[PDB]
Design a protein around this ligand. Sequence first.
Ligand SMILES: *C/C=C(C)/C=C/C=C(C)/C=C/C1=C(C)CCCC1(C)C
Length: 133
Amino acid sequence: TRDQNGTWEMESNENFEGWMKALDIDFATRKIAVRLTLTLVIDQDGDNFKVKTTSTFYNYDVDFTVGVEFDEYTKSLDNRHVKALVTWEGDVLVCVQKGEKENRGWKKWIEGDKLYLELTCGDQVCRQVFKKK
Ligand SMILES: *C/C=C(C)/C=C/C=C(C)/C=C/C1=C(C)CCCC1(C)C
């Protein structure tokens, strides 16, 4: 299904550290964030997405429209300018962030009652799994 609406609680996080390191997130921030349980709140209406990523210490928000390129400044993440584009490949939602880092972006999809998120940067892949709250 393409329906990713919901409140999603993290149950698994693979190689989060390797991915953050590939983005050059500073050593001290990584120590805090690496084992936090993340919650994703996704509001999806047609192409319009509002995604909130929350944890005890860090709260992020991004809004986008599927099919519409948007320039992003990655703020409290790695502080870079990228050109972002989110599209569908079948029922996989694919984000490409063009800029300095190669292979930068993510893919999100649903299997049963679970949301899967694959984050990529350089040669690093982080895989996260969430259950619907
Ligand atoms: C569609 C799912 C998306 C866009 C989720 C993106 C998640 C992040 C950019 C997460 C960033 C971080 C936190 C919320 C705290 C943990 C460490 C960070 C900085 C990687």
